[PDB]
Structure 1
Amino acid sequence: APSFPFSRASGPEPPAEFAKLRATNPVSQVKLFDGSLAWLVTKHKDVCFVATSEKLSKVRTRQGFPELSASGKQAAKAKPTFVDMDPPEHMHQRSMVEPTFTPEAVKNLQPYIQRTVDDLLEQMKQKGCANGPVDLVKEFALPVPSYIIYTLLGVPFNDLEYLTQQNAIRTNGSSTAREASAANQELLDYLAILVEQRLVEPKDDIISKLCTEQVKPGNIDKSDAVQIAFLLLVAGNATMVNMIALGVATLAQHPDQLAQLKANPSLAPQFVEELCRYHTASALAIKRTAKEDVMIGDKLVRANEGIIASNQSANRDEEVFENPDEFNMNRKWPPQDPLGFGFGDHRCIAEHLAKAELTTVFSTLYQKFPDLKVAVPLGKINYTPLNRDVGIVDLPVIF
């Protein structure tokens, strides 16, 4: 039973194990860091089954849950938020915050998303690159999602830059454990004060809605409101940053795709679709324990055994996506959904928001900067460590 998680084959590539498994061993056991086992599911049909089966649970206090690291195991001890809940608790809590994220709400947010992107691009332009390249991550990929989610939560504008930096320290590979933990607690302490403030004087933000609609009637406590807000901040932000950077790198890697997007920015939605399939930057979230025996393919998953369903592997499944290892913005899409945002009731609350942020980026960036170029050879890009989800740490650019 091989150790899991697997390391990526190279900076921008999935782990090499998954194609082999899809071909010869699609449902198989892997060994986790603590010596426990889990079933690894690799085919799109089977990932969808795992994501939707009511015989499977996300509750992390169930013995058999596939925690992938020592830190994951300690994190499982806390009071869960909706990410780790089953029905009916899951939607009881998730419904408290899903209004901001609906397709229609995100459509109505489009002008705000556009203005945020425009403003950050203009700051980049005013800074310029006369003295050499600038880091597209720090200057752009980081602040776009950060400013948006903090603003939606209720953070005032003058606090965005500092809080963006502190949330990045949580996940920066260069942070020490103390630095990351202190940043985590700093943000929680900040959000607690915002909850206190919005309970006394609500404003038109997510924290205020939690306060008025859930804390004041006694449906949740203040501490719960803080933890729900924190989940919305930390769940997806670093993933968004990585997706922006990976999109820029991918366009540089495939010049004719960039040429097409520059000639027709209305292709941004389809570029984003392909990006979210090809670069599955959150690949380790579709995890379960079996509450009772369940058959998956030619395997029996027994009660209290763990399951990891790779959406990354599903998104490269040749039975669903023809020529899956080719990046093609002009892909002819099958009926089956790509799984970049997961599947089933737990499917990313922010899928529509994330796609709108990415579409806005990729329909704007090369209109602003038609001569944007990565300022190092592409083979020297600084990707996330290979034992992590795919991403980019920094990306020197000129324009």
Structure 2
Amino acid sequence: APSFPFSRASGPEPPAEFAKLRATNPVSQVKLFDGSLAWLVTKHKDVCFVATSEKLSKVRTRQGFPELGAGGKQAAKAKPTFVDMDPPEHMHQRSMVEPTFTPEAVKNLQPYIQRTVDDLLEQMKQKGCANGPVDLVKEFALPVPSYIIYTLLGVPFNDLEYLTQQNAIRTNGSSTARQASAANQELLDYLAILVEQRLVEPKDDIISKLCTEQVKPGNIDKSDAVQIAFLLLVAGNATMVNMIALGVATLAQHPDQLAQLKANPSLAPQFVEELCRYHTASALAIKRTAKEDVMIGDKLVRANEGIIASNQSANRDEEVFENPDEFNMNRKWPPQDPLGFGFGDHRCIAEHLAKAELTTVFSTLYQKFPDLKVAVPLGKINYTPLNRDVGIVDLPVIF
């Protein structure tokens, strides 16, 4: 069994291992950091099965859960929320915050998403780049999703640097156990204060609804509200930042497609679809354990063994997406769903929100800055460590 997770082949590419596995060993065992063996699923059909099987559990502290690092064990000590639940507990709590993320709710949020993007881009225009390139991440990719979720949750914009820093320390593989633990607690303490404020004086935000609709009536306690707020604050935000940055790098890498997008910003939706398939910025989150013996592919997975379903590999499945390793926003989509946002009950609660933010970004960015260019050779882009999910730390640009 090979050590897992695997490292990306190069900055923007997925691990080279997946291709061989899909072709000759689709469901296999891998060796985790603690010496335990877990099952790696690489084919689209199998990942979909894993995401929908009633025989598998999402419970993180359940016996056999496949933590990928020593830090995982500590994170798992967090109070369980819907992301760690199976039916009926799952939807019982997820339904408490789902209203904000429905297709209808996201559609009504469009004017605000547009304004948020418009304002951030205008500031870049005013700051200019006469004295050199600016970091698209810090000035745009970072504040776009951050400001939106902060408004939805009820978090003050001024705390962007602090909250971003603390979560970075918490999830950074280079952080000592102590440093990561302190960071996680600073995040909870911060949100506890906010939840307490809303219990006394509610506003029209997610935290407030949790308070008036669930806490006061005694359906969940104060600590549950804090954990839910924590989950919505930390899950996916950094991933959105990376997706925006990766989208810009991809367009610079595919000049012909950028030309099409500039000529017609209405192509943004299809660009976003290919982006979410090609760059699977969340590739190690679909993890489960078998409640009982069950067949996954042609392999018998025994009760309590861990499973890791790679939606990244599924998105590069050559038996589903033609010429999978080529980025082409003009591809004709097959009947099979791309899995950038997962599948089944746990499919990203913010899928509609995320795609709207990305669609707004890519239908506006080049209209605002038609001459936007990545200011460093593409081969020199500062990507995230190869042993982690694909992303970009900073992206110098001119316009």
Structure 2 length normalisation: TM-score?
0.97
Whole-Å Cα distance in 2 between the matches of residues 62 and 354 of structure 1? 30
Whole-Å Cα distance in 2 between the matches of residues 36 and 162 of structure 1? 36
Deviation at residue 275 of structure 1 after TM alignment: 0.2
Per-residue CA deviations over 1:53-102 (Å, capped at 9, x if unaligned) read 00000112222111111001122233211111111111111111011000
CA gap 1:170/1:116 in 2 versus in 1, 3 angstroms: farther
CA gap 1:266/1:159 in 2 versus in 1, 3 angstroms: same
CA gap 1:203/1:287 in 2 versus in 1, 3 angstroms: same
Per-residue CA deviations over 1:198-233 (Å, capped at 9, x if unaligned) read 111110000000000000001111111011001001
CA gap 1:380/1:251 in 2 versus in 1, 3 angstroms: same
2:100 corresponds to 1:100: yes
Deviation at residue 161 of structure 1 after TM alignment: 5.4
Whole-Å Cα distance in 1 between the matches of residues 171 and 397 of structure 2? 23
Whole-Å Cα distance in 2 between the matches of residues 138 and 71 of structure 1? 27
Per-residue CA deviations over 1:4-42 (Å, capped at 9, x if unaligned) read 000000000000000100000011111100011111110
Deviation at residue 167 of structure 1 after TM alignment: 4.2
Deviation at residue 193 of structure 1 after TM alignment: 1.3
Whole-Å Cα distance in 1 between the matches of residues 172 and 71 of structure 2? 16
CA gap 1:297/1:173 in 2 versus in 1, 3 angstroms: closer
Contact 2:271 2:329 in 1 (8 A): yes
Contact 1:265 1:363 in 2 (8 A): yes
Alignment-derived partner of residue 85 in structure 1: 85
User: What is the aligned-residue RMSD (CA, Å)?
Assistant: 1.5
Contact 1:134 1:396 in 2 (8 A): yes
Per-residue CA deviations over 1:305-352 (Å, capped at 9, x if unaligned) read 111110000000011101100100001001110000000000000000
3-state DSSP class of the match of 1:283?
coil
Percent of aligned pairs with the same amino acid: 99
CA gap 1:103/1:388 in 2 versus in 1, 3 angstroms: same
Whole-Å Cα distance in 1 between the matches of residues 59 and 163 of structure 2? 31
Contact 2:71 2:177 in 1 (8 A): no
3-state DSSP class of the match of 1:295?
strand
CA gap 1:78/1:170 in 2 versus in 1, 3 angstroms: closer
Whole-Å Cα distance in 1 between the matches of residues 383 and 115 of structure 2? 29
Contact 1:143 1:164 in 2 (8 A): no
Contact 1:152 1:205 in 2 (8 A): yes
Alignment-derived partner of residue 27 in structure 1: 27
Deviation at residue 158 of structure 1 after TM alignment: 4.4
3-state DSSP class of the match of 2:217?
coil
2:234 corresponds to 1:234: yes
3-state DSSP class of the match of 1:289?
strand
Contact 1:52 1:343 in 2 (8 A): yes
Per-residue CA deviations over 1:102-136 (Å, capped at 9, x if unaligned) read 00000000000000001111111111111111111
| Segment of structure 1 superposing worse, 105-114 or 174-183 | 174-183
CA gap 1:154/1:255 in 2 versus in 1, 3 angstroms: same
Whole-Å Cα distance in 1 between the matches of residues 291 and 83 of structure 2? 18
Contact 1:147 1:164 in 2 (8 A): no
Per-residue CA deviations over 1:234-282 (Å, capped at 9, x if unaligned) read 0101100000000000000010010011001000000000000000000
Deviation at residue 168 of structure 1 after TM alignment: 4.6
| Segment of structure 1 superposing worse, 170-179 or 381-390 | 170-179
3-state DSSP class of the match of 2:30?
strand
CA gap 1:384/1:343 in 2 versus in 1, 3 angstroms: same
Whole-Å Cα distance in 2 between the matches of residues 20 and 223 of structure 1? 45
3-state DSSP class of the match of 1:300?
strand
Whole-Å Cα distance in 2 between the matches of residues 75 and 164 of structure 1? 17
3-state DSSP class of the match of 1:48?
helix
Structure 1 length normalisation: TM-score?
0.97
Deviation at residue 355 of structure 1 after TM alignment: 0.2
CA gap 1:171/1:57 in 2 versus in 1, 3 angstroms: closer
| Segment of structure 1 superposing worse, 78-87 or 313-322 | 78-87
Contact 2:79 2:227 in 1 (8 A): no
CA gap 1:88/1:357 in 2 versus in 1, 3 angstroms: same
| Segment of structure 1 superposing worse, 179-188 or 379-388 | 179-188
Whole-Å Cα distance in 2 between the matches of residues 147 and 341 of structure 1? 21
Contact 1:66 1:288 in 2 (8 A): yes
Contact 1:243 1:391 in 2 (8 A): yes
CA gap 1:307/1:123 in 2 versus in 1, 3 angstroms: same
CA gap 1:167/1:301 in 2 versus in 1, 3 angstroms: closer
Contact 1:171 1:238 in 2 (8 A): no
CA gap 1:295/1:157 in 2 versus in 1, 3 angstroms: closer
Deviation at residue 177 of structure 1 after TM alignment: 5.9
| Matched residues, number | 399
3-state DSSP class of the match of 1:47?
helix
Whole-Å Cα distance in 2 between the matches of residues 167 and 57 of structure 1? 27
Whole-Å Cα distance in 2 between the matches of residues 397 and 23 of structure 1? 39
Whole-Å Cα distance in 2 between the matches of residues 363 and 30 of structure 1? 41
CA gap 1:371/1:169 in 2 versus in 1, 3 angstroms: farther
Alignment-derived partner of residue 17 in structure 2: 17
CA gap 1:175/1:143 in 2 versus in 1, 3 angstroms: farther
Deviation at residue 375 of structure 1 after TM alignment: 0.5
Whole-Å Cα distance in 2 between the matches of residues 290 and 181 of structure 1? 29
Alignment-derived partner of residue 291 in structure 2: 291
